[PDB]
RNA sequence: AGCUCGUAUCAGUUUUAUGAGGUAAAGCGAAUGAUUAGAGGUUCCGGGGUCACCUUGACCUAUUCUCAAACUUUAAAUAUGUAAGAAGUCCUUGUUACUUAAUUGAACGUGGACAUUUGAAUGAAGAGCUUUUAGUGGGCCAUUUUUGGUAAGCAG
RNA sequence: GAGAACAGAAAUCUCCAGUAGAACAAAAGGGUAAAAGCCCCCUUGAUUUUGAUUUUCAGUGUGAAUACAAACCAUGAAAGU
RNA sequence: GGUUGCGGCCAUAUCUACCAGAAAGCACCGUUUCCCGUCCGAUCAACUGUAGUUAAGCUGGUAAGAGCCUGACCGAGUAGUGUAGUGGGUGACCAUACGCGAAACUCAGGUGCUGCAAUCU
């Protein structure tokens, strides 16, 4: 009979990183997880209790619950024709803050500072992000940087 | 050279390997008991060998360790029949050294009745003060190259004491 | 006789015809499975909050 | 059982299937000796290095390697004697081929099921090679070059597909080009090791480097 | 010996403090982990350990960048309160427990509340919470790598912190005077050890038995010309002095910071630069090839 | 069949940032498993030959050659999770029978400021929701990945 | 590996190296070094009321497991488990 | 700036040989009445910092050191790969167009940084 057990096909998912076996460092317990923070799931092989399913490895969702030694994480799971609120009860070893919040929050603070300065001097400080616009015209000069030719080289076997 | 970089006799282990268990085992235990002033421990067989009349966990040995003045005096007493000399062999590469006497019960004490006969191995654990650095719990360090004990160091020390020589053969 | 076993063909197109839809998250989501110790604190807290606000507004 | 035509096992259709604890009941490879000729000759004795390189990506059967080795040894040896060359069969027979044993007797359709449980039993060994990989590598004195290339041309006839005779720019079986290996050997940072050489690195404990290569330090100092 | 490069390449070092053996990371994990629904409430540790000719007791809080201390005490501050010799004994442990407890309660503004017990009778008594007021300041004992045994110096500091108005959660099983034929501590034995009973009785015993040991040992006591019976008086005096002003008057720092740093530097070695390394290896290779 | 609204809580999409993976590859002077060839070195755990007598049987050290679906330090492409705000941020003070040593925090808030862009691009064809019911539940092929097989207009 | 009478390849003991090449009931995988391994002490939480959640999935059941709460406990010096 | 206590990152910290360490600190070290534990005060427990020491530990420095980490227009835009073709070839596979883009290697560099508290010629 074909096996679809809880930790099927998990030969490499829970491999502790090379030269990173043993007890995990203590910042993972010393972090704080308030409700509404969005965190990803990097399962830890060493700790057994609270292990997620292999499907949630690498996913990311908000924390809906904070517990004695664990948090409750909401993940969207694509099954059938629509997503579902999968609610995990994860020991705090297998989670860690997703830095997307950190970058978004610091961009929000910087944007608010930009809005304040525009509220004082220099309006239209271009609040939105702008993608990598095409490079505007430039002069490329030729002192010491004389154009030296490059010719295609003959095929040498080198075997 | 240095007041406390010289070798010392931490512990002398005395071993009596009894063939079987029982009254003979108790005899070895009692005799080594009055010899060392302390009760030895029973060394249960590790695995059954099937050729020695010995099954695992069958109490086939009796050994005790001695440290301090008791160890010093009992080493003197051991060598008093070893002729205060040994061989180039019997010296371990780590510094320790040993020798097995064939009898003590009438050799050093009165041969009482109901004791039988017994021979024992002396094995001197020979090193220098400061080796607690590897056996203590907190900050369990490791000794350095110089503080290590070698066979040439131990043979020099064994010349310096006991009026001893090496390579009896 | 021999009937075929499994096939994912056309299933993604079936899933994308009516379109895979988000669950439409709401303000004040369901307080299900959140810590009960926190739940009943929240209970007494909201009771008191509505009391204080309405009493202040008279 | 009669050996199958190699036209069945020409290509690298299946995954590598090596002799392991999962692939237990396997025969042994036909080819056993991989270095031939004066195999203990020092590196400078045989400067020239020639290669018989496959130009495609197929499976070379172990016994085919063995037979081509036989013929390549034969021509070169009877042309320039026993010890004018050293040949090395680079590829190795690790792939274990499978045959689905069958019965072709009278009315075997009864006693045989055909394709039910058609996992084949090990048939033999073959060596997987890709494009550009070297099959044969012969080293010899430069004057031996016509002899070794004609021997390699005779060895090529035992291999399916297209192979080529490439006169490597390297010095023997080494990983250095000829003119700059000449500089290295003259500078003296090369120590023979029975058949090959040891190279002096710019990195390493200088006492160990002095133990192995005094000649380099003397040649620089003088 | 002669470790292979593969081993030294796949060798996973333990955490530095475990490499040096100072910290037990397994127990530290559960010492610093917090009920996650207590988001930013630190788990304060009463870390009391013993380096010879010293005692080191402190209150520590766990932060991401490191452990930040609330208030600390050491042996060499006891002489201010009078305890001159035996600045690492069991009674010294209890005394510095009182000191650090009153010190941290003073720091966080809980002097009048949680006075602890003045006439300590060696009775296991956690500081009871004040009626209609804040609960007592709760800190968690951290012995460290050292073993727990009945009647240990670490648990002397346990009793000191407990009696200094600082609630530590603990049990009396390992206080001295714990029988096993009965589950009751000996309050007399505990209280007597508190004032140096295990030291004073050995004072009088050595004085009766001989004079050579009583003089070679406790020679610092012989300098003060103090017998056994004055130890309890001086400990009571030191306890009251601790209870009076645990203000932590620091040292004078004579020969101050610049002199310290420059003097340490003047004898401190330095790492030779790359040019020095290349020139010295050039000299070494030339010397080794100098027709050797 | 509609219903509630009227340009959105959106997207088989992308960018920025951020993860996650262990395939392709690469690797064995890296672990485990294989492997070809030698070079230099052993205890009275055998020299097999004169009882420590060159004397061969190992093991290690530096190498060299080729590998691995059920090996791997490393590691792509593609595919994939998330976020890119008004359901947010910031300030102050309000409830808690939770938490705190606490008049601490957590949660939920009160009041106050948040247009040029309310915070990436592109599109939005209206968006969201409910009920109900039919047929279907024998599949087939093509490029690419790939399993068994010699291979198949073969089977998966 | 080096040693110690009987005692040799294997009996017991000592020291040294030992990133784990061992052990954890049972297949394989993963994981674990002051421990998840061996020894010693104490126990029964292998208990009750349920409810929620993950996997198989129709987000049904059964099975398995996770995280709590309300109790009562065990252990520990305690956090904690 | 050194040391101690608690640590954060978890080898740029490890490992192997050699050396140095002013003051403080640490350690070794001294002794067993009680607490405590063993066969052994060796570990642990108690007491003194009293007899001394840097011998060791610890710290640090040295090594054309192994390792570890970083970087390179170093290998190499190579291998691989998404997409496309009524492209080549019989095929194995390959060349191209638009993209992404390694690893081993070669070399250069580096060998702990730091937080809180305390203390020191």
Swiss-Prot record, chain A:
PANTHER family: 60S RIBOSOMAL PROTEIN L21 (PTHR20981)
Location of the protein in the cell: Cytoplasm
Residue(s) of cross-link: Glycyl lysine isopeptide (Lys-Gly) (interchain with G-Cter in ubiquitin): 31
Similarity section: Belongs to the eukaryotic ribosomal protein eL21 family.
GO cellular component, one term: cytosol
PROSITE patterns reported for this sequence: RIBOSOMAL_L21E
Note: There are 2 genes for eL21 in yeast.
Function: Component of the ribosome, a large ribonucleoprotein complex responsible for the synthesis of proteins in the cell. The small ribosomal subunit (SSU) binds messenger RNAs (mRNAs) and translates the encoded message by selecting cognate aminoacyl-transfer RNA (tRNA) molecules. The large subunit (LSU) contains the ribosomal catalytic site termed the peptidyl transferase center (PTC), which catalyzes the formation of peptide bonds, thereby polymerizing the amino acids delivered by tRNAs into a polypeptide chain.
Name of this chain's protein: Large ribosomal subunit protein eL21A
Keywords for this protein: Cytoplasm, Isopeptide bond, Ribonucleoprotein, Ribosomal protein, Ubl conjugation
Parts of the chain that traverse the membrane: none
One example GO MF annotation: structural constituent of ribosome
Cited InterPro entries: Ribosomal_eL21, Ribosomal_eL21_CS, Ribosomal_eL21_sf, Translation_prot_SH3-like_sf
Quaternary assembly: Component of the large ribosomal subunit (LSU). Mature yeast ribosomes consist of a small (40S) and a large (60S) subunit. The 40S small subunit contains 1 molecule of ribosomal RNA (18S rRNA) and 33 different proteins (encoded by 57 genes). The large 60S subunit contains 3 rRNA molecules (25S, 5.8S and 5S rRNA) and 46 different proteins (encoded by 81 genes).
GO annotation terms (biological process): cytoplasmic translation
Organism the protein comes from: Saccharomyces cerevisiae (strain ATCC 204508 / S288c)
SUPFAM superfamilies xrefs: Translation proteins SH3-like domain
């Amino acid at each position: 009979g074909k096996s679809h057990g809880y930790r099927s096909r998990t030969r490499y998912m829970f491999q502790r990183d090379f030269r990173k076996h043993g007890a995990v460092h203590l910042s993972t317990y010393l972090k704080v997880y308030k409700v509404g923070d969005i965190v990803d799931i990097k399962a830890n092989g060493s700790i057994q209790k609270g292990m997620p399913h292999k499907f949630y490895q690498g996913k990311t969702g908000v924390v809906y619950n904070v517990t004695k030694s664990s948090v409750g994480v909401i993940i969207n799971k694509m099954v059938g024709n629509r997503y579902l609120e999968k609610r995990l009860n994860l020991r705090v070893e297998h989670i860690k803050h997703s830095k997307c919040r950190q970058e978004f929050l610091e961009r929000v603070k910087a944007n608010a500072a930009k809005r304040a300065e525009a509220k004082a001097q220099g309006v239209a400080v271009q609040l939105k992000r702008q993608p990598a616009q095409p490079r505007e015209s430039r002069i490329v000069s030729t002192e010491g940087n004389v154009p030296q030719t490059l010719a295609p080289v003959p095929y040498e076997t080198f075997i | 050279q240095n007041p406390m970089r010289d070798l010392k006799i931490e512990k002398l282990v005395l071993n009596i390997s009894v063939g079987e268990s029982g009254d003979r085992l108790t005899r070895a235990s009692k005799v080594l008991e009055q010899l060392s002033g302390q009760t030895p421990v029973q060394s249960k067989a590790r695995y059954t060998v099937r050729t020695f009349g010995i099954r695992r966990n069958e109490k086939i040995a009796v050994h005790v360790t001695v440290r301090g003045p008791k160890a010093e005096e009992i080493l003197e007493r051991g060598l008093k029949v070893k002729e205060y000399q040994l061989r180039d062999r019997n010296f371990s590469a780590t510094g320790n050294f040993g020798f097995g006497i064939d009898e003590h019960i009438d050799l050093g004490i009165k041969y009482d009745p109901s004791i039988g006969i017994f021979g024992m191995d002396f094995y001197v654990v020979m090193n220098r003060p400061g080796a607690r650095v590897t056996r203590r719990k907190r900050c369990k360090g490791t000794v350095g190259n110089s503080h290590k004990t070698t066979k040439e160091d131990t043979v020099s020390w064994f010349k310096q004491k006991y009026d001893a020589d090496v390579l009896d053969k | 006789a021999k009937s075929k076993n499994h096939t994912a063909h056309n299933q993604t197109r079936k899933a994308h015809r009516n379109g895979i839809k988000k669950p439409k998250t709401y303000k004040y989501p369901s307080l299900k499975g959140v810590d009960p110790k926190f739940r009943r604190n929240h209970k007494h807290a909201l009771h008191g909050t509505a009391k204080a606000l309405a009493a202040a507004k008279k | 059982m009669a050996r199958r035509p190699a036209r069945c096992y020409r290509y690298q259709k299946n995954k590598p299937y090596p002799k392991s604890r999962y692939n237990r009941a396997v025969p042994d490879s036909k080819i056993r000796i991989y270095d031939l000729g004066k195999k203990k000759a020092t590196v400078d004795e045989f400067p020239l290095c020639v290669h018989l390189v496959s130009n495609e990506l197929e499976q070379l059967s172990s016994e085919a390697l063995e037979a081509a080795r036989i013929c390549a040894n034969k021509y070169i040896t009877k042309t320039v004697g026993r010890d004018a060359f050293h040949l090395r069969v680079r590829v190795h027979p690790f792939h274990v081929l499978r045959i689905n044993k069958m019965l072709s007797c009278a009315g075997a359709d009864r006693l045989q099921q055909g394709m039910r449980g058609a996992w084949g039993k090990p048939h033999g060994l073959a060596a997987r090679v890709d494009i550009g990989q070297i099959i044969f590598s012969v080293r010899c004195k430069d004057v031996n070059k016509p002899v070794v290339i004609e021997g390699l041309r005779r060895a090529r006839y035992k291999f399916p597909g297209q192979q080529k005779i490439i006169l490597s720019k390297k010095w023997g079986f080494t990983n250095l080009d000829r003119p700059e290996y000449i500089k290295k050997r003259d500078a003296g940072e090369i120590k023979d090791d029975g058949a090959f050489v040891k190279f002096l690195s710019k990195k390493g404990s200088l006492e160990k480097n002095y133990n192995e290569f005094p000649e380099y330090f003397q040649n620089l100092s003088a | 010996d002669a470790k292979s490069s593969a081993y030294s390449s796949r060798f996973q070092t333990p955490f530095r403090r475990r490499r040096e053996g100072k910290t037990d990371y397994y127990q530290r994990k559960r010492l610093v982990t917090q009920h996650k629904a207590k988001y930013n409430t630190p788990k304060y540790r009463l870390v009391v350990r013993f380096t010879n000719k010293d005692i080191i007791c402190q209150i520590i809080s766990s932060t991401i960048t490191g452990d930040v201390v609330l208030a600390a005490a050491y042996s060499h501050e006891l002489p201010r309160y009078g305890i001159t010799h035996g600045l690492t004994n069991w009674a010294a442990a209890y005394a510095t427990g009182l000191l650090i407890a009153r010190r941290t309660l003073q720091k966080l503004g809980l002097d009048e509340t949680y006075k602890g017990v003045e006439e300590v009778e060696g009775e296991y008594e956690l500081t009871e919470a004040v009626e209609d007021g804040p609960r007592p300041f709760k800190v968690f004992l951290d012995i460290g790598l050292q073993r727990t045994t009945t009647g240990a110096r670490v648990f002397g500091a346990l009793k000191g912190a407990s009696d200094g108005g600082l609630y530590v959660p603990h049990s009396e099983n390992r206080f001295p005077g714990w029988d096993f034929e009965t589950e009751e501590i000996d309050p007399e034995l505990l209280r007597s050890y508190i004032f140096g009973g295990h030291v004073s009785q050995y004072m009088e015993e050595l004085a009766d038995d001989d004079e050579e040991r009583f003089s070679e040992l406790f020679k610092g006591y012989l300098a003060d010309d103090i017998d056994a019976d004055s130890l309890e008086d001086i400990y009571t005096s030191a306890h009251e002095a601790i209870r009076a002003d645990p203000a932590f008057k620091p040292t004078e720092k004579k020969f101050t910071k610049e002199q310290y740093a420059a003097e340490s530097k003047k004898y401190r070695q330095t790492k030779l630069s790359k040019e020095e390394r290349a020139a010295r290896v050039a000299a070494k290779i030339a010397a080794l090839a100098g027709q050797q």
